[PDB]
Amino acid sequence: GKKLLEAARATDEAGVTPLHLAADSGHLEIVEVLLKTGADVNAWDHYGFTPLHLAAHVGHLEIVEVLLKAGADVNAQDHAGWTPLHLAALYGHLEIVEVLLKHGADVNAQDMWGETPFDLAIDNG
Amino acid sequence: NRMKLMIVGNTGSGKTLLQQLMATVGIDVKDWPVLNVWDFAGREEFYSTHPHFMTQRALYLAVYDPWLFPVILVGTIRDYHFVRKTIINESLAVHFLNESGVLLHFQDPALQLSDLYFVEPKWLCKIMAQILKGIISRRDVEKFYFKLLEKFQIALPILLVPSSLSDHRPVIELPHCENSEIIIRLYEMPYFPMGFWSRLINRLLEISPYMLSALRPNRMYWRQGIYLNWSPEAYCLVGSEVLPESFLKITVPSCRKGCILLGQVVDHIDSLMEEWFPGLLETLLKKWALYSFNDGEEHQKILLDDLMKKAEEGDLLVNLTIPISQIAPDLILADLPRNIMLNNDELEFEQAPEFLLGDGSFGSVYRAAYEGEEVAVKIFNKHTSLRLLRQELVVLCHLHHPSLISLLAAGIRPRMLVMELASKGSLDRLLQQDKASLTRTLQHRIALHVADGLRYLHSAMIIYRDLKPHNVLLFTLYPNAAIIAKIADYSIAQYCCRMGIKTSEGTPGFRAPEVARGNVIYNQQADVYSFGLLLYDILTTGGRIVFDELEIGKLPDPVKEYGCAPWPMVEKLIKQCLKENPQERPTSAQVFDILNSAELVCLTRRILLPKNVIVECMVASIWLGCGQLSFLDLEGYTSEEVARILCLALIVSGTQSGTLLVINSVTCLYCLLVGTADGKLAIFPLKILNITPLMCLSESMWGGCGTKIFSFTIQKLIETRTSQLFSYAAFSDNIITVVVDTALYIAKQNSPVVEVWDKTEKLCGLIDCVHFLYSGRVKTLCLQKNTALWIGTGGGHILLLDLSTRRLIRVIYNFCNSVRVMMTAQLKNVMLVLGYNRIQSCLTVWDINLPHEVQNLEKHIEVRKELAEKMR
Ligand SMILES: C[C@@H]1CN(c2cc(-c3n[nH]c4ccc(OC5(C)CC5)cc34)ncn2)C[C@H](C)O1
Ligand SMILES: Nc1nc2c(ncn2[C@@H]2O[C@H](COP(=O)(O)OP(=O)(O)O)[C@@H](O)[C@H]2O)c(=O)[nH]1
Numbered sequence: 003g004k005k006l007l008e009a010a011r012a013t014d015e016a017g018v019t020p021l022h023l024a025a026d027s028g029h030l031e032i033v034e035v036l037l038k039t040g041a042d043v044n045a046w047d048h049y050g051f052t053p054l055h056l057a058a059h060v061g062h063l064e065i066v067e068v069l070l071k072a073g074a075d076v077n078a079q080d081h082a083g084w085t086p087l088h089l090a091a092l093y094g095h096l097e098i099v100e101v102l103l104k105h106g107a108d109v110n111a112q113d114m115w116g117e118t119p120f121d122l123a124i125d126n127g
Numbered sequence: 128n129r130m131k132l133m134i135v136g137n138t139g140s141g142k143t144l145l146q147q148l149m150a151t152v153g154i155d156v157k158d159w160p161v162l163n164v165w166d167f168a169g170r171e172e173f174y175s176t177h178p179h180f181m182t183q184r185a186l187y188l189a190v191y192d193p194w195l196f197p198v199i200l201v202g203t204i205r206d207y208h209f210v211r212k213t214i215i216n217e218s219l220a221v222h223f224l225n226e227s228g229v230l231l232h233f234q235d236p237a238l239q240l241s242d243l244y245f246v247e248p249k250w251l252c253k254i255m256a257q258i259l260k261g262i263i264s265r266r267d268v269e270k271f272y273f274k275l276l277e278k279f280q281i282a283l284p285i286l287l288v289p290s291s292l293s294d295h296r297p298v299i300e301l302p303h304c305e306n307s308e309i310i311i312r313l314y315e316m317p318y319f320p321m322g323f324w325s326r327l328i329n330r331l332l333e334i335s336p337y338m339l340s341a342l343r344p345n346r347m348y349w350r351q352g353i354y355l356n357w358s359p360e361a362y363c364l365v366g367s368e369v370l371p372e373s374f375l376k377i378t379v380p381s382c383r384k385g386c387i388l389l390g391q392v393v394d395h396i397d398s399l400m401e402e403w404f405p406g407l408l409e410t411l412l413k414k415w416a417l418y419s420f421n422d423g424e425e426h427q428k429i430l431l432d433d434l435m436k437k438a439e440e441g442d443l444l445v446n447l448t449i450p451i452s453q454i455a456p457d458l459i460l461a462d463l464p465r466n467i468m469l470n471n472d473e474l475e476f477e478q479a480p481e482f483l484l485g486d487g488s489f490g491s492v493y494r495a496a497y498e499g500e501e502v503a504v505k506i507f508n509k510h511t512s513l514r515l516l517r518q519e520l521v522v523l524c525h526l527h528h529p530s531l532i533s534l535l536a537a538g539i540r541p542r543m544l545v546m547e548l549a550s551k552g553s554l555d556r557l558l559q560q561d562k563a564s565l566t567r568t569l570q571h572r573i574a575l576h577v578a579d580g581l582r583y584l585h586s587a588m589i590i591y592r593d594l595k596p597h598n599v600l601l602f603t604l605y606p607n608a609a610i611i612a613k614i615a616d617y618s619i620a621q622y623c624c625r626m627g628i629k630t631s632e633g634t635p636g637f638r639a640p641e642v643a644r645g646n647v648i649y650n651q652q653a654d655v656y657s658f659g660l661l662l663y664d665i666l667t668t669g670g671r672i673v674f675d676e677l678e679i680g681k682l683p684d685p686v687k688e689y690g691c692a693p694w695p696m697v698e699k700l701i702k703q704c705l706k707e708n709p710q711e712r713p714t715s716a717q718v719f720d721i722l723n724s725a726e727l728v729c730l731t732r733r734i735l736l737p738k739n740v741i742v743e744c745m746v747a748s749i750w751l752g753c754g755q756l757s758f759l760d761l762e763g764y765t766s767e768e769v770a771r772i773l774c775l776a777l778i779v780s781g782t783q784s785g786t787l788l789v790i791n792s793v794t795c796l797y798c799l800l801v802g803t804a805d806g807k808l809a810i811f812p813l814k815i816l817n818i819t820p821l822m823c824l825s826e827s828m829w830g831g832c833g834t835k836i837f838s839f840t841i842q843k844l845i846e847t848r849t850s851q852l853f854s855y856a857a858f859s860d861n862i863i864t865v866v867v868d869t870a871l872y873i874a875k876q877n878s879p880v881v882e883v884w885d886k887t888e889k890l891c892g893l894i895d896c897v898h899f900l901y902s903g904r905v906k907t908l909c910l911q912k913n914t915a916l917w918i919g920t921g922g923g924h925i926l927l928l929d930l931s932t933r934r935l936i937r938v939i940y941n942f943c944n945s946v947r948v949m950m951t952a953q954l955k956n957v958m959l960v961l962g963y964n965r966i967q968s969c970l971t972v973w974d975i976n977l978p979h980e981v982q983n984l985e986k987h988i989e990v991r992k993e994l995a996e997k998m999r
Contacts, residue, residue, distance in 0.1 A: 011852060016895070026855050048897055049879060059857040082902035082921060092877075114902065114922075115945065115965050 010036075017047035025065050026056040033068055043074045050080030058086035063097045076105045083114035091123035099123075130218070131182060131228050132162045136190035138169030141203035141210075144190060148211055153256030154180055156228070156249035162186070162218070163228045172259050172290040175322040176279050180252060184226050186218050193318050196406055235648035236641060236709040237627025238278045255279060261291035261350070277625070280325045285332065289325040292350030296366065299347075302359045303380050306426065310389055310453065311417035313428060314375035314396070320404045324367070326626075328353050330399055331365065331392075333624050334588075337525075338363075338391045339384060355388075363388045365396075381453055390462030394517055398622055402629055418454045420447040434458060435513060439540070458513065459539055464524060469538035473498050474545065478506060485553070485597065487616045489515055490544070497536060497545050507542040515618065516542050522617040526587050527998035529991055530580030532600065532615040549600035549613065557604075558596055558668055567694075567728065568606035570665050572987075573599065574697075575722050576612040579991070581658055582715040584614070585651045590623040594657035595637040596664055596672070607983065609990045623651050633657075635675035640707055643679045652709035656680075658718060659704025666701065667691050680705045696727040723988060725981040726939060729974040731957055733942070734762055736968035742961055746775045747952040749959070749970075754782060756790070761954065761972070774802075797824040806832050808839075816841060823865035827910070829886075831862030836871060836884065845888045847873060853893050854880045864908040868930065872916060874905040881905055881918060892933070894918075899926055899935045907949040909958065915978040919946030923962060927978045936978045943969035951975065 004013070010020035010032050021041045024032035033053075037043070044052055054074045057065040066086075070076070077085050087107055090098040099119075103109065110118055134142045138150060145166050149159055153173060155166035165185070167177060174193075187198045199206040199217055206213055221244070225232055231248040234241050245251060258268055258276070263286050265273070276282040283289065303309055331353050336343050338355070345356040352366025361384035368376045377392055379385035400407055416434050417426040429444075437444060438451045438458045452461040460468075476482070476495030484492040490507040497504075507516060516539070523534040523544070533547045551557070554573060557565065577599055584591050591614070598616045602608075619632040627648035633639075639656035641647045663682065664670055667689040671682070682705065686693050700721050706712045713721065721727070736742070736751075736759075744752035751757035754770020769788070774781040774796040781793030787801065795802030801809035802821035808830075809815055816839065821832040828839050836845035851859040858878035866872040870891055871884035881894035897903035902921030909917035915936055918926040923941035928934065943962030952959045954972065962969035974980070 015898070022855075026857055027851065028856075048895075049903075056855060056857055059855075060860075081897065082904065117965075 013047075016049065017045075019045050019047075019053075021045070021053050022047065022051070022056055025053040025062070025069065026060055028060060028062050028065070030062070030065055030068060033065060037068070037072050043069060043072050044078070046078075046080075048081075050082070052078050052080075054078065054086050055080060055084075055089060058089040058095065058098055058102070059093070061093060061095045061098065063095070063101060066098055066101055070101070070105055076102060077108040077111060079111075079113075083112075085111050085113075085119070087111065087119040088113065088117075088122050091119045092126055094127060129161050129163065129227060131165055131185040132159070132214070132218075133165045133167060133181065133185045133187045134190060135167045135187055135194045136169055137192070138171075140169055140190040140192055142166050142169065142190050144201070144203060144210060148214070152253065154249070154252035156252065165228075168256070173256055175290055175325045176255055176281055178321050179279060182226055186214065188214070193321060196318070196320050196404075235627060236652060237648045237650050239710070240274070240278075241708075241710070251275075255281060258282060259288060259291045260293055261288045262286075263288055280322055280329055280626075283329050283332070287328070287332070287348065289328050289348070289350060292348055294350060296349050296352060297347070299354055299364065301362065301364060301378065305422050306419040306424075307422045307453075308381050310379050310381050310385060310456065311426065312377040312389060312393060312455075313415035313417060314377075315413040315415065316373045316375070316407060317411055319367070319373050320407070323404060324351050326399060326403060327365070327396065329626070330395055330624060331355070334391070334395060338388060357384070360384055361388065363392055365392060386452075386456035386462040390457045393457050394521060395622070397514060398518065402621070416455045418444070418449055420449060429454075431455065431458070457517070460517075460520070460537060463520065463537065467524065467534055467536050469536045469540075469543065469545070470498070471538065471540070474504075474536075474543075476504050487618050489618045490542075492546075494548070495545070501548045502535065503546045503548045505544040505546065507544070511542065513539070513542075516544065518621065519544065519617050521622070522584075522589055522620045526583070526589070528580055528583040529610055529994045529998065530576045530613055531583065532613050546615070549602050551601040551604055553597055554599040554601055554612065554665075555596035555672070557601060558664065558670075559673055562668055564604050565665075565668060566606060569604065569611070571722070571728050572606055572608075573601070573612040574662055574665060575719070576610075577614065577661060578658065578715060578719040578722050580614040581654055582719045583995075584620075585654070585715045588622060588624060589620055590628060590651045591617070591654050591657075592619050592621070592633050592642070593637070594654060594661055595634055596661065599661070607987075609987065609994055636678055637661075639709070640679040641709060643675070650709065652712055652714070655704050655709070655712040655715065655718065656706075658715070659701050659712075662697065662701050662704065666694055666697060680707060693732055695730050695733045696721075696724075700727075723984070725937070725977060725984045726942075728984070729977045729980050730942075730971065731954075731974055732761065732970075732972035734759070734970040734972075736970060737764060738967050740766075740968045741963075741966060742947060742968050743771060743773055744775045744948060745950070745959070745961055746777050747950075747959070749952070750775060750778055756780065759970070792820075794820055794822045795824050795830075800824055802830075802832075808832075820861060823862050825865045825867055827867050829865050829867045829871065831865045831873065833861050834859075834875075836862070836865065836873070843886075843888060845871075845884065845886075847882065847884065847890075850882060850890055853890065854878075863905060866908045866910050866916070868910055868913075872908060872910075874908045874918075877904050877921075879903040879905060879920075881908065881916075894928065894933065896920055896926055899928075899938060900924060902945075906946050909949050909951060911951075911958075911975060911978070917949060917958065919949045919960070921945060925949075925960070927981070929978075937981045939977075942971055 007020050010023040021036045046052060054069050057069055087102055090102060134145055136142050145164055151166055151168045157164050189200045190203055192203055198204055202209040221232055224230055230246045231251055232244050277284050335355055339357055347354040354364045356362045360380055360382055364378040366376055368374045379389040414431040415428040416431055417428055419426050434455050435458050442451050442459055444451055451459055456462050474497045478493055482494040484494055484503055489511055490505045492503050492505045495502050495504040536545045600613045600615055602610050627650055629648050631642050631645045633642050637657055637660055639653035641649045642653050663685055664672055667685045670689050685691055704712055742752050749759045749761050751759050752772050752775055754768055756769045757766040770782045772780050772782050773794055776796035776798050779789050779796055781787050781796055783792040787793055792804040794804055799811035804820040806818035806821055807815055819833045824830040830837055834848040836847055848860055858880050861876045863874040863876055871886055873882040879896045883892040885891050896905055896918055904921040905918055906921055907919035916928045923943045925939035927936035943964050945963040947963055948961045950959050956975040958973040958975055960971040
């Protein structure tokens with residue numbers, strides 16, 4: 003049964019993988035043991051997010067490094083056409099912004115509204 | 128100065144004559160100085176397509192050792208010769224080029240090739256003839272374009288290729304060989320027009336599935352006949368026979384199905400002759416009925432006109448006696464469904480001017496009573512024929528729709544055509560007299576029902592051609608009724624197969640531009656322009672009616688000219704229906720689909736702000752935001768710099784600096800309440816309730832500062848970050864809006880989840896805006912009183928969710944690109960939606976009854992669908 007999702011919190015209808023919850027909740031050990039188990043690092047849910055997206059959204063740079071060493075997608079588009087650069091520059095995560103641009107980040111990515119990461123960095127400090 | 132010169136004649140005549148003037152396949156086109164000759168082929172296989180290449184500017188030479196249906200005759204009628212000087216003596220932008228002969232082009236919508244000009248017309252004539260036991264498949268001739276083959280009656284899609292078929296008629300031994308067992312109808316013509324048999328065969332193998340009922344019969348062809356066969360008791364043998372004239376013989380069994388088939392076949396033959404060979408009906412054509420008093424002698428013939436005169440009085444033929452219903456069951460309507468049969472003893476009517484209901488250009492409709500109920504009777508004029516009544520009954524029978532008028536009984540003795548009575552009259556009288564009862568719901572329902580009737584008529588291979596408010600009848604003025612508007616007056620309704628229609632009929636001022644041309648072969652798309660005109664009239668009420676020149680289309684905008692309230696998505700539909708190109712117009716089904724939407728009904732206004740203007744807030748005359756302040760008159764834009772500006776509340780403004788001003792970083796103003804980015808809650812400075820950024824405030828006192836819900840003096844500091852157990856912690860961790868009716872509907876920054884909280888201070892559920900659904904992140908929340916919850920997403924979607932069952936009512940399509948701020952205002956309660964188009968600001972006004980109208984429209988459509996199913 004699907005009784006492992008709650009363990010990482012403390013798939014589904016949306017399509018949430020326990021790696022997503024581990025990355026979002028701030029747990030790095032669960033992420034590390036899930037990568038060894040052979041999970042999916044580029045799994046998209048109904049919201050279109052990937053573990054890197056949530057990791058950039060919360061602001062855990064260590065988890066960002068762990069998922070960037072496993073071979074994730076540095077530039078992935080969710081349902082809104084957003085990449086981890088937008089989420090990192092929207093919440094003032096300068097360290098995550100710097101770490102993202104070292105693995106091949108697209109700094110000129112246009113979302114479905116047409117904005118680039120620089121636009122969100124300038125509109126929110 | 129140049130013109131054509133056709134050399135026509137039978138095969139082998141010598142058309143060896145053109146060369147001296149200076150077996151061919153198709154048409155030979157040359158040049159002869161000035162005169163571009165057109166040598167025709169005398170072989171019978173090309174005769175079907177020969178008429179398509181005959182014009183009036185030419186100098187036809189008839190070469191002899193049909194065509195005539197400035198001609199001079201030469202042997203091998205302005206002159207006569209036997210075998211160059213006589214030809215010269217006797218001979219003395221895109222459309223004009225076709226007549227000259229430089230290139231060929233057909234602008235008629237029926238052939239659907241008005242965007243293809245081909246030079247070298249001689250190539251087309253040769254190509255049309257290289258394809259010709261005539262029967263082939265597509266792959267057979269691909270290895271030796273197929274839109275011209277079926278459009279010239281040369282290769283019908285079944286590919287029949289009616290030409291080159293076996294001239295030898297087979298030995299068809301029908302059942303019921305006795306005289307009292309078959310009905311024989313004879314058409315006598317001096318000659319068969321070119322392409323007549325091909326056109327007749329094409330028409331007959333298109334109505335065969337629907338000639339009896341949809342069941343397909345067995346079919347045979349021999350290029351001058353066709354045998355349709357459903358059973359030993361239901362067949363039809365239409366073919367050519369000989370006795371110095373040309374005879375078309377129709378044989379059917381003398382039973383109910385045989386009579387039905389004979390009626391259908393004679394109706395279709397008559398319509399074919401009227402549409403494509405009017406010369407025979409100007410009489411050259413004689414129609415006979417074959418009868419025998421006993422079943423042992425040769426048939427005798429009586430003209431159909433004499434038989435009609437005899438059937439005018441009594442239904443019996445006397446010498447020995449035969450009933451007319453077994454000789455010509457089409458004169459007396461014996462082939463009709465026989466449920467609509469007159470009962471003259473049961474009909475009472477007087478035909479007085481006080482009982483007149485209207486006119487139909489061929490008869491007058493009167494008030495009457497039939498079987499004890501009020502009805503409408505269309506007495507046909509004395510200068511009419513049975514053909515008009517039969518072609519009206521073509522539509523009034525076999526077609527039953529909730530948007531089409533219903534027939535009850537028809538007679539031949541007075542030619543009466545009793546119909547049903549509209550309870551509220553016609554739409555023309557309502558537009559011109561009852562201007563106050565035309566609510567928006569009634570207008571939309573009338574348009575919807577007319578569109579439904581047009582769609583059904585077009586689906587039934589019928590073109591209406593006369594769509595005016597006079598022909599639209601109202602059965603009730605109550606908007607929530609299944610039947611409101613109906614279509615009548617099928618006098619000029621004619622069959623429209625995949626061959627087009629040539630005759631131009633329609634009332635001036637209510638017809639498509641092509642029909643008014645009078646020289647084009649048009650199709651069912653001519654009714655879409657009429658429907659667009661009708662929609663324009665309904666929107667403008669009286670309007671242009673209370674003319675023809677400027678509608679063929681230079682009509683003004685409905686709103687400014689007649690001062691009618693704006694109706695977006697209706698003006699757009701009018702514009703795309705009033706198109707000069709029939710192919711660009713939507714079909715009747717597409718028009719019905721466009722009208723069948725509650726977004727069309729409930730969108731009251733749509734105001735476009737100047738480009739590159741960004742709005743942050745607005746209050747209701749609607750004051751706008753942006754340091755810069757604006758104002759709008761719900762149209763007029765006034766803007767000036769005063770300080771950006773974040774919140775407005777009347778007029779008190781708030782800037783992201785801490786300075787609040789009144790004109791005769793603050794984040795929330797409510798009514799006075801002030802919410803800054805630090806957490807303080809001012810009262811207007813009576814007190815300060817400092818608590819990060821306070822951005823929400825509601826009362827039904829509630830609000831939210833950061834990720835926590837308060838109440839006020841702060842009552843309940845309901846912390847709401849503790850919800851990461853459900854949905855992402857990223858979504859769980861600032862509140863965008865707070866909305867409360869019984870629970871606390873909370874939207875958060877970039878969170879597609881609308882949290883629900885009890886006011887037990889505990890979570891009660893999650894609403895996923897992406898599950899119902901392109902960015903699903905919630906921007907705005909709005910409440911309608913015990914009706915629905917309005918959610919404005921990051922995209923242009925508005926989700927209407929039921930307050931009780933949390934079920935989706937409708938997702939409003941992308942009117943604009945991003946819902947910024949939404950509120951309900953008093954304009955008539957409306958919902959004010961401010962959107963973006965990234966940068967074009969976008970203001971939309973919606974009727975507050977959008978969910979109710981969605982439900983009402985879907986229920987109405989389902990009810991009408993069940994009614995339409997029950998009709999048949
Ligand atoms: C006001 C008055 C007028 N009335 C009508 C009724 C009709 C009408 N009914 N059924 C029809 C069937 C055919 C028909 O063919 C037209 C469109 C050729 C006139 C009219 C009616 N057409 C005008 N007015 C009904 C009474 C109660 O009310
Ligand atoms: N002996 C003779 N033969 C003729 C005369 N006129 C025409 N022909 C023949 O008739 C044929 C005419 O064929 P033509 O009419 O051009 O074929 P079509 O265009 O398909 O009808 C030629 O092959 C000639 O040999 C004539 O005056 N005398």
